[PDB]
């Protein structure tokens, strides 16, 4: 799926994404990203033979900061993409009444089915 108003620069997030609410701090996805950064720092201390859980706390803090920052911007991009998908979908629902009719909600007083008993 492509443009969708192909003026469209490279544009990592438009100004229209500042209308939807931004992702909160300590949302569980960025907490999972922080845990993944801490596991990255632990295993980085494990690749070289420096001791684990020590001697790299500035690298631990750098990894956590870098992953949480990048994941924050990617989550804002995710929210923008889902918002524009729903906006385009409901615009197409409103723009064409013919193909999407009201279905007759026949209640179960008059809807017949087969039965097929398991004896």
């Amino acid at each position: 799926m492509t443009g969708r108003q192909a003026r469209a620069p490279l544009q990592f997030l438009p100004d229209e994404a500042r209308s939807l609410p931004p992702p909160k701090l300590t949302d569980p996805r960025l907490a999972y990203i922080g845990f993944l950064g801490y596991c990255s720092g632990l295993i980085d201390n494990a690749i070289r033979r420096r001791p684990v859980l020590s001697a790299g706390l500035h690298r631990q803090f750098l990894y956590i900061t870098s992953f949480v920052f990048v994941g924050y911007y990617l989550l804002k991009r995710q929210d923008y993409m889902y918002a524009v998908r729903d906006h385009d979908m409901f615009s197409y629902i409103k723009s064409h009444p013919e193909d999407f009719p009201e279905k007759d909600k026949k209640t179960y007083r008059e809807v017949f089915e087969e039965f097929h008993p398991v004896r």
Binding site: K105, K106, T107, Y108, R109, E113, E114, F115, P117, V118
Partner: protein, 171 residues
Amino acid sequence: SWDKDVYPEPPRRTPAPSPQTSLPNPITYLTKAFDLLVDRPVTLVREFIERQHAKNKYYYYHREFRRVPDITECHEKDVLCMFEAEMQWKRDYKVDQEIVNIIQERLKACQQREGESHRQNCAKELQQFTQVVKAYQDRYHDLGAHYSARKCLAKQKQRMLAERKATKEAA
């Protein structure tokens, strides 16, 4: 306690034994000794415990429900209608199983009370047992394990449509 009209009991019939000859009667001495050694102390213990119970007063109530309308009034999908519908149907199913349990306990008690003549004063309870269980065999039986409520209404429609064809042939 319990209602005497849902778990019925016939009135008691007890003779007065007239001893012909005089040995006499070991079990009378033994049941008087049983009364004096068992019946008095357990009664005193129960009376003490009942006073300790009736110092305070607890109460438990019976949980009661309402009538959410139907499954016959729910639409195509409408999951927040079918939910109340099928839970109301499932609670009817549980209480109806226990109706069958009550009738079958009545049949067992009629067997054991009436003695070695089964067919005297057990015709009525066997009659109502076959009645309610014919209703159960007609209504809930041949649907299987994944009953929700909708297979029961499908069986309902299919059975009354087959009997409609039968009475059309009988017309």
